[PDB]
Structure 1
Amino acid sequence: IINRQATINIGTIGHVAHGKSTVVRAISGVQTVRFLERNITIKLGYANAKIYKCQESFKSDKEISPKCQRPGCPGRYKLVRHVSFVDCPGHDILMSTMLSGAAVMDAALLLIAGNESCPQPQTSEHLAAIEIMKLKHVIILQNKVDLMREESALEHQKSILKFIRGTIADGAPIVPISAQLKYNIDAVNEFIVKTIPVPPRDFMISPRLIVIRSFDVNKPGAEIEDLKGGVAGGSILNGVFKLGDEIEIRPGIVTKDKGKIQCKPIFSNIVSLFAEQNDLKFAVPGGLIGVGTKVDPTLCRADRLVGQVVGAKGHLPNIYTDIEINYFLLRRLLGVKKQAKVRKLEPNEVLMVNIGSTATGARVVAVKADMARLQLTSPACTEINEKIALSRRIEKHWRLIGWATIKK
């Protein structure tokens, strides 16, 4: 069996205490990163699944084990795909991480529990976000079905169907699966192969990398004369990387505190690539790879590198402090428990603008009709156009309003 890395990024959405990590575990086997130094940087974890098919019935086709002994046929499984999971939490406080996750995602998985109430605002918000950020491949999954009645589940399904009609997602498949009992995952696997294809990707496009997580490889007990370099957990959308290249983290860093800053973006040479489980020479875009570079282990510690752009040497993108946005607003607010009408944008107000993966606070200067000018506090970079989600404050915490695009 060949040790091929991740091909396409699949993300999972839900709610707090509903069950997402458990579902992930059921799907794959290797436990999630979340659940001080290691793993702790963002809200998303790290998981990997296997797609191997046995074609020699009905729904039973794909499996989780490398060896086929369970269904009947003793023959070895055929290699189809290998996928990486991006598990994003569905909490009312933390959403920036989710947004960041969304930017890299190519496939989405919705989770709704049976026993709880049918209309949930957070789930709706998530769906809206998915719709916004160039995602159409959505599979609806029912979580807790075993604790529900014979007709109640059907009713719930009907309600769901009624709800999802006017949205961009038209032909979304619905699967009921148990997380604690471990059943019906084969159908899900089959669907993964059926409904979702891999988009065309080539070597010709300029390298662009997005870092979500940060890692320091330091072990207690062992002497200091045996050290390991700083690892940046970064996912790639476009551009193939190989071992032996120069990488730079774009936005900038503060090194001296009197004296104006002039220091260039953080340069680092690649030491070792961590994909799936074992090290590989080539990096195929469409997965999260722990890129171990010559960067400090102290820098890759905690909340320092959350959603930052990474480029290869011989390419020049632009850095902006003032940004030109083309926005579109929604009718009523999504996320609030009660629904409130969206007000027109007022000059000079603190609003959270999420350009791809960056979590930045911006203030409005001029409003016309569709075009808006924003002043940023923390530095941000622009490459092409980018997919932007906008968030405002009305009551206590952040609420989503609509979508935006950079006009440059």
Structure 2
Amino acid sequence: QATINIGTIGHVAHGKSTVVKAISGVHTVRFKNELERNITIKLGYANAKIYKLDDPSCPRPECYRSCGSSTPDEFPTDIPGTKGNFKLVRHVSFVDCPGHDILMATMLNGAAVMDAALLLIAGNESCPQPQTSEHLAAIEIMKLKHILILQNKIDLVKESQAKEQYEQILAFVQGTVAEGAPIIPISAQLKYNIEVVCEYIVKKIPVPPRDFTSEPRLIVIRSFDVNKPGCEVDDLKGGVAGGSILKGVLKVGQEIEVRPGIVSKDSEGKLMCKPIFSKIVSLFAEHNDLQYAAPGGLIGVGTKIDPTLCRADRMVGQVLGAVGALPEIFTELEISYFLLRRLLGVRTEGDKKAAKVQKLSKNEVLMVNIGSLSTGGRVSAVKADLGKIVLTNPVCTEVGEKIALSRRVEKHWRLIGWGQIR
């Protein structure tokens, strides 16, 4: 299954497929083929098995040696050991977030259900690069600090440039946790020092305490239909949710409720929403059958919902509770909030436009990323430490946790501040 969710976030032009296939062995993929124009801009999924020969390096199935195929310029070979079967240490899960700035709201959502991260830095561009800081800050807000910085694209980048970049990032982030996070330079054109990464992810990132006894909550981020185009009438199936569970052991045959709900017909107001109920058909993770779905892992829960809800990606950031979950489904919400004194996620060589942003004005639409949900809503009352927001589609608030608040600076939204629900 899975034990931890390590995320693979990283700004434009570092190469995703080479690094993702080295760590998991499962390709990051989704629509267009044209696998991506540059680096993956979709929310990729992948799981993997991490075993040892009693060595800090992680074998392949063929554990005698491993000859890469990253480049035919030279032969990159590494040796994990010699063969006689290897001991399974754990089953790991990844969360490949978008690597592009416009997709920030999606990157936030996907990130918010991980248990650790890997900041994929690229040495090609600017030294205190916008997105590195954006990522790091969001991570410390959500409730994580289990980060391993990875210098992913320094294959042709000289050692002065690459040294200056790690220095400037680590010096800018002087108020964000990063001093207890290692910085592992690797090759992505010769897959070198990959074996030492395997030692790091088992060290810096154990399994955090998971609450089995507590009531099941599944947060769905990806939508999958298994009926698909060309289905037969008596080959009928349910609709499958790619979600991570962050609380409770969800068992097979259990009934689960999707709690933001669907709005009642001919509503004259903003209420009323009614949750949808679906019975769990199957609990699939990796490529191995399971009867349980332990928390701390990203699992494909097939449920008895019908094709229309899974025919496109429409279940992004929905909260699912088993069953008749107590969590309130607000339509208008009381945010406590604070703002950054800089504009996060933007800053170029001329140092534009990380200038301090003006105060929020009422009746402006802002993206409130609450939980893994992403709703848009307008601010109806605006006091400094008390704003009232009215949301277009209702938000199930599992706990008052955190929020991330963004404002439409130009073409798309950009992160301005965070806070906590009251």
For the criterion TM > 0.5, the same-fold answer is yes
Q: Which digits, 9 at most, give the CA deviation of each residue in 1:260-295, with x for residues without a partner?
A: 986731111111112111221011111111111111
CA distance in structure 1 between the partners assigned to 2:421 and 2:267 by the alignment: 34
CA distance in structure 2 between the partners assigned to 1:369 and 1:119 by the alignment: 31
| Amino acid across the alignment from 2:179 | D
Q: Give the match for residue 51 of structure 2.
A: 52
Name which of structure 1's ranges 108-117 and 154-163 shifts more when overlaid on structure 2. Answer: 154-163
Q: Which digits, 9 at most, give the CA deviation of each residue in 1:237-260, with x for residues without a partner?
A: 001011111111111225857899
Per the TM alignment, residue 6 of structure 1 is displaced from its structure 2 partner at its CA by 0.1
RMSD: 2.4
Name which of structure 1's ranges 142-151 and 82-91 shifts more when overlaid on structure 2. Answer: 142-151
Per the TM alignment, residue 313 of structure 1 is displaced from its structure 2 partner at its CA by 2.0
Question: Which of 364, 369, 376 is equivalent to 1:361?
Answer: 376
Question: Which of 292, 295, 300 is equivalent to 1:290?
Answer: 300
Residue 211 of structure 2 contacts residue 295 of structure 2 at CA under 8 Å; is this kept in 1?
A: no
| Amino acid across the alignment from 2:260 | P
Residue 389 of structure 1 contacts residue 404 of structure 1 at CA under 8 Å; is this kept in 2?
A: yes
Change (3 A) 1:35 1:112: farther
Within 5 Å, give how 1:90-109 maps onto structure 2.
90-109=99-118
Secondary structure of the structure 1 residue equivalent to 2:19: helix
Q: Give the match for residue 13 of structure 1.
A: 9
Residue 231 of structure 1 contacts residue 297 of structure 1 at CA under 8 Å; is this kept in 2?
A: no
Per the TM alignment, residue 212 of structure 1 is displaced from its structure 2 partner at its CA by 0.6
Change (3 A) 1:180 1:134: same
State yes or no: 1:325 paired with 2:324. no
Residue 316 of structure 2 contacts residue 373 of structure 2 at CA under 8 Å; is this kept in 1?
A: yes
Q: Give the match for residue 63 of structure 1.
A: 58
Residue 52 of structure 1 contacts residue 78 of structure 1 at CA under 8 Å; is this kept in 2?
A: yes
Q: Give the match for residue 89 of structure 1.
A: 98
Change (3 A) 1:241 1:154: same
Q: Give the match for residue 31 of structure 1.
A: 27
Secondary structure of the structure 2 residue equivalent to 1:334: coil
Change (3 A) 1:371 1:223: closer
Residue 241 of structure 1 contacts residue 283 of structure 1 at CA under 8 Å; is this kept in 2?
A: yes
Q: Which digits, 9 at most, give the CA deviation of each residue in 1:355-407, with x for residues without a partner?
A: 01111112222233322211112211112212211101232321111111111
CA distance in structure 2 between the partners assigned to 1:223 and 1:347 by the alignment: 52
Change (3 A) 1:396 1:275: same
Within 5 Å, give how 1:256-271 maps onto structure 2.
264-271=274-281
Secondary structure of the structure 1 residue equivalent to 2:102: coil
Per the TM alignment, residue 224 of structure 1 is displaced from its structure 2 partner at its CA by 3.1
| Amino acid across the alignment from 1:322 | E
Q: Which digits, 9 at most, give the CA deviation of each residue in 1:175-203, with x for residues without a partner?
A: 11222322211111100111122211232
CA distance in structure 2 between the partners assigned to 1:403 and 1:262 by the alignment: 28
Residue 49 of structure 2 contacts residue 88 of structure 2 at CA under 8 Å; is this kept in 1?
A: no
Per the TM alignment, residue 302 of structure 1 is displaced from its structure 2 partner at its CA by 0.8
Q: Give the match for residue 336 of structure 1.
A: 346
CA distance in structure 2 between the partners assigned to 1:164 and 1:75 by the alignment: 46
| Amino acid across the alignment from 1:359 | S
State yes or no: 1:299 paired with 2:294. no
Q: Which digits, 9 at most, give the CA deviation of each residue in 1:32-90, with x for residues without a partner?
A: 23269xx9xx93111112221232xxxx6221424532334434322211111100112
Name which of structure 1's ranges 79-88 and 338-347 shifts more when overlaid on structure 2. Answer: 338-347
Question: Which of 358, 366, 373 is equivalent to 2:388?
Answer: 373
In structure 2, list runs of 5 or more residues that go unmatched.
Answer: 36-40, 66-79
Question: Which of 184, 189, 192 is equivalent to 2:193?
Answer: 184
State yes or no: 1:195 paired with 2:204. yes
Residue 248 of structure 1 contacts residue 311 of structure 1 at CA under 8 Å; is this kept in 2?
A: yes
Residue 347 of structure 1 contacts residue 366 of structure 1 at CA under 8 Å; is this kept in 2?
A: yes
| Amino acid across the alignment from 1:29 | G
Length-normalised TM-score, structure 1: 0.90
Length-normalised TM-score, structure 2: 0.87
Name which of structure 1's ranges 280-289 and 223-232 shifts more when overlaid on structure 2. Answer: 223-232
| Amino acid across the alignment from 1:114 | G
CA distance in structure 2 between the partners assigned to 1:134 and 1:201 by the alignment: 14
| Amino acid across the alignment from 1:11 | G
CA distance in structure 1 between the partners assigned to 2:379 and 2:27 by the alignment: 43
Q: Which digits, 9 at most, give the CA deviation of each residue in 1:146-182, with x for residues without a partner?
A: 2122433333333333334332333110111222322
Per the TM alignment, residue 222 of structure 1 is displaced from its structure 2 partner at its CA by 6.4
Secondary structure of the structure 1 residue equivalent to 2:309: coil
| Amino acid across the alignment from 2:335 | I
| Amino acid across the alignment from 1:68 | C
Q: Give the match for residue 414 of structure 2.
A: 399
Give identity over the alignment, percent: 75
Name which of structure 1's ranges 172-181 and 150-159 shifts more when overlaid on structure 2. Answer: 150-159
Secondary structure of the structure 1 residue equivalent to 2:200: helix
Secondary structure of the structure 1 residue equivalent to 2:340: strand
CA distance in structure 2 between the partners assigned to 1:91 and 1:296 by the alignment: 32
Q: How many residues align?
A: 395
